[PDB]
Structure 1
Amino acid sequence: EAKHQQQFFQFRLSGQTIEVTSEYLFRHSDNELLHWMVALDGKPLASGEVPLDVAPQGKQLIELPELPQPESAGQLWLTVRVVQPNATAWSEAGHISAWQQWRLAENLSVTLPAASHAIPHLTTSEMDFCIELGNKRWQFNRQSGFLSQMWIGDKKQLLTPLRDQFTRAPLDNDIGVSEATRIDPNAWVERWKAAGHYQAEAALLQCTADTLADAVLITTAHAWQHQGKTLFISRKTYRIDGSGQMAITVDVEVASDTPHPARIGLNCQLAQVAERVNWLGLGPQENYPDRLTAACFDRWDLPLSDMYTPYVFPSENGLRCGTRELNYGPHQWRGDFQFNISRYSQQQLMETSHRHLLHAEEGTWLNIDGFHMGIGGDDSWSPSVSAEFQLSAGRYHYQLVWCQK
């Protein structure tokens, strides 16, 4: 982020041309070339290299060629980079000094899914709701109202039920100068624990199931309470399609008087560990709602070890925003969400105070959040998060599609 925000080259896309403005004051652009690439949902279509000849604090105009626009559904992204060909005394050959990305024309998906010939079968137990579709199987716990288990063949895929998560591991900016012996009432973590965010117990309100013509609909509605005061109300709709897709639509209502939650989304612990994570979204670095300018939208395939940022003081880390697709092992999640996946739970990151004392848990912890709250950074003793990055709307909605690839 520091590298992207301190670039000596500013880019402005107008129509099809690109205005490049140098911020150098004394040197001429003699060791830089511009490399542009157009990608449809992570799949490249066209590319080219244009040398840069920019005067100090000057202007240059680059006229792009005919950009291919296919009729396939997706979003076209244009990414430009500045590459230094020769080796400077402080940089190697091929060093990138600046980059920028823009959203080109979008082709919305208007096609219809094929008719599901096979229909899901629903068994209504006294304490469970079990949906079977060939190899696929799901089991909802009627006592808790959450997705208790998923089955492919005879292998369990969930160690813990897929629940909601309105809390995160407190960051260094959230704690502030608050200790055990000194309590700062303005610190975000103290307001969260004072309102019972970390101690809220989910109470089941509604849990119904009914079969449709070609699908099975599960309607769940919970409420989080603390000392008789309701903080959050979550209403979820689960749809099992005959093609195998799980459509989860979640609506969250947050009280106005309670402190703004740091996270609105889901949480689970998968029973299978994988060595690769392939996500289409903003990356490949750790990015947040107030720190996503450096990240670029593309398809990134990275090992699970790089999903966890090795902060010595444990906190929330590894979040990737603007994620359009996420492939992990046999699981695929689609929609617009912010995901973080690691081997350590959020409660372990909260309890532990050193990274060397952290231990990898069974399975893999995954946190998919429809909405995430900022990190701040103006100072480490006062709330530094701007009002535009705080979860203060009151009503939130997000849709997830869970399938097996």
Structure 2
Amino acid sequence: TEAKHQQQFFQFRLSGQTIEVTSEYLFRHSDNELLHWMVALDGKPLASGEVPLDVAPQGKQLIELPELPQPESAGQLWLTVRVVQPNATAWSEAGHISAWQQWRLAENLSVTLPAIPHLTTSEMDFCIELGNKRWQFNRQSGFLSQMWIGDKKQLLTPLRDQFTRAPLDNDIGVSEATRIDPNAWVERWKAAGHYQAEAALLQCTADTLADAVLITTAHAWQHQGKTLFISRKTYRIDGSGQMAITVDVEVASDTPHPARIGLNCQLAQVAERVNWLGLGPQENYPDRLTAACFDRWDLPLSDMYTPYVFPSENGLRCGTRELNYGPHQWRGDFQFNISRYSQQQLMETSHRHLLHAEEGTWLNIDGFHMGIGGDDSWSPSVSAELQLSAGRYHYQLVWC
């Protein structure tokens, strides 16, 4: 689909209210083409229309959109156009989409303003109660170890920072089985000990505010006395049941740049659908997301796993502002994937048919994710602006 979008024969430019369509056909007029446009406010459709394409080969057609309805709610307005072929051809069905493009329109930042959670202090854990719910923070590990909705535990594995991915074929960087590229990203990550790095708890305290509870943690990841990453976190659990998570990550400049900076947990839930506001229905990465579109997407959970024959990191969706899985909701500005296979099982399994679904749902939420490359697959091919080289990283997430 990335190939389809980049190779599309119509190119689009949005002046202000005008869409300029350019034909990259050399010989045919656009005689089987219908432009559909839609304006949505973070997934919700506000306006839509249809305009027949009437563009010569290598020519341009100006399409003036009507007066768009400047809404009242906060959020980002998005314009999406798609060229549909209303007639079947010898090679395509009626209604075939041949080209599309999306733009941000006007944005309206929200300035609207929003019991009290109870903090139990044991020597081994911090427990925060609000209503039926509980949050449990292991004071020895420093991680949120368990969550309670009603009577039922929500996690099978604690919420923990993750800096690695199960390596893609581009990460592995081999074209002949007998020759290993020592500059390959997986060779550099393994030699740096990214997959072996142990978290050293630096700080984990709890403070009761007059409207919430604040858990502060700091961890250092180390391999052989070298600190690779430091993760500083604050968890703000308010009376409205939200858990605001702020993460500041420092990466040593001399370590190879990590594949991702995010969080990972094994949810106890196995739900059927994934619902979320972000880029594209399909899998998209920071290096490959131009074909994706921002919208509200809703797919079965099997659709969020790409069954590459050699298993690797897969199924990521970027630009996500909201993710819904069962009763849980995560908001912010993140990338995610979600599936029944941990990154460890993906990395250790040579064939997709040897994968087995693990008992809950593995959730990877990334503030930051490296590009996937692909200029070739036998040398480092992620461009320098798609590498996580900034050294300090910040992201915020809200879970309910």
**TM score, norm. by length of structure 2:** 0.99
1-structure distance, mates of 2:122, 2:312 = 40
How many aligned positions are there?
Answer: 399
Q: Using a 3 Å threshold, how does the CA distance of structure 1 residues 186 and 154 change in structure 2: closer, same or farther?
A: same
Partner SS for 1:194:
helix
Q: Deviations over 1:11-42 (max 9, x none)?
A: 10001011111000110111101110000010
How far has the Cα of 1:183 moved from its partner? 3.5
Asked if residue 61 in structure 1 is aligned to residue 58 in structure 2, the reply is no
- Is the 8 Å Cα contact of residues 178 and 187 (structure 1) preserved in structure 2? no
Partner SS for 1:323:
strand
- Is the 8 Å Cα contact of residues 282 and 298 (structure 1) preserved in structure 2? yes
Q: Deviations over 1:131-165 (max 9, x none)?
A: 00011110000000000100011100000000000
How far has the Cα of 1:182 moved from its partner? 4.3
1-structure distance, mates of 2:398, 2:252 = 27
Q: Deviations over 1:200-219 (max 9, x none)?
A: 00000000001001110000
2-structure distance, mates of 1:199, 1:86 = 57
2-structure distance, mates of 1:77, 1:99 = 13
Q: Deviations over 1:28-84 (max 9, x none)?
A: 111101110000010001111011110110111111101011121010000001011
Partner SS for 1:269:
strand
Q: Using a 3 Å threshold, how does the CA distance of structure 1 residues 382 and 180 change in structure 2: closer, same or farther?
A: closer
Alignment of 1:224-373 (within 5 A): 224-373=221-370
- Is the 8 Å Cα contact of residues 175 and 377 (structure 2) preserved in structure 1? no
2-structure distance, mates of 1:183, 1:7 = 37
How far has the Cα of 1:310 moved from its partner? 0.8
How far has the Cα of 1:179 moved from its partner? 8.2
- Is the 8 Å Cα contact of residues 315 and 337 (structure 2) preserved in structure 1? yes
Q: Using a 3 Å threshold, how does the CA distance of structure 1 residues 180 and 53 change in structure 2: closer, same or farther?
A: closer
Partner SS for 1:192:
helix
1-structure distance, mates of 2:348, 2:258 = 20
2-structure distance, mates of 1:132, 1:162 = 18
How far has the Cα of 1:184 moved from its partner? 2.1
Instruction: Find the counterpart in structure 2 of residue 81 from structure 1.
Output: 82
How far has the Cα of 1:380 moved from its partner? 1.0
How far has the Cα of 1:178 moved from its partner? 7.7
- CA RMSD, Structure 1 to Structure 2 (Å): 1.0
Moved more, 146-155 or 172-181: 172-181
How far has the Cα of 1:88 moved from its partner? 0.6
2-structure distance, mates of 1:88, 1:184 = 47
- Is the 8 Å Cα contact of residues 181 and 379 (structure 2) preserved in structure 1? no
Partner SS for 1:239:
strand
- Is the 8 Å Cα contact of residues 202 and 224 (structure 1) preserved in structure 2? yes
Q: Deviations over 1:176-213 (max 9, x none)?
A: 12888643211100000000000000000000001001
Asked if residue 399 in structure 1 is aligned to residue 396 in structure 2, the reply is yes
2-structure distance, mates of 1:53, 1:99 = 16
How far has the Cα of 1:382 moved from its partner? 0.5
Q: Deviations over 1:102-154 (max 9, x none)?
A: 000000000000xxxx1000010001000000111100000000001000111
Asked if residue 110 in structure 1 is aligned to residue 111 in structure 2, the reply is yes
Q: Deviations over 1:354-382 (max 9, x none)?
A: 01110000011000010000100001111
- Is the 8 Å Cα contact of residues 178 and 184 (structure 1) preserved in structure 2? no
1-structure distance, mates of 2:30, 2:353 = 46
Q: Using a 3 Å threshold, how does the CA distance of structure 1 residues 180 and 160 change in structure 2: closer, same or farther?
A: farther
**TM score, norm. by length of structure 1:** 0.97
Partner SS for 1:356:
helix
Identity of matched residues, %:
100
Tell me which stretches of 4 or more aligned residues in structure 1 moved more than 6 Å.
178-181
2-structure distance, mates of 1:200, 1:335 = 27
Q: Using a 3 Å threshold, how does the CA distance of structure 1 residues 231 and 178 change in structure 2: closer, same or farther?
A: farther
1-structure distance, mates of 2:197, 2:248 = 18
Partner SS for 1:197:
coil
- Is the 8 Å Cα contact of residues 313 and 353 (structure 1) preserved in structure 2? yes
Partner SS for 2:90:
coil
Gaps of 5+ in 1: none
1-structure distance, mates of 2:310, 2:120 = 47
1-structure distance, mates of 2:178, 2:130 = 56
- Is the 8 Å Cα contact of residues 118 and 128 (structure 2) preserved in structure 1? yes
How far has the Cα of 1:241 moved from its partner? 0.5
1-structure distance, mates of 2:331, 2:69 = 26
2-structure distance, mates of 1:383, 1:174 = 7
Gaps of 5+ in 2: none
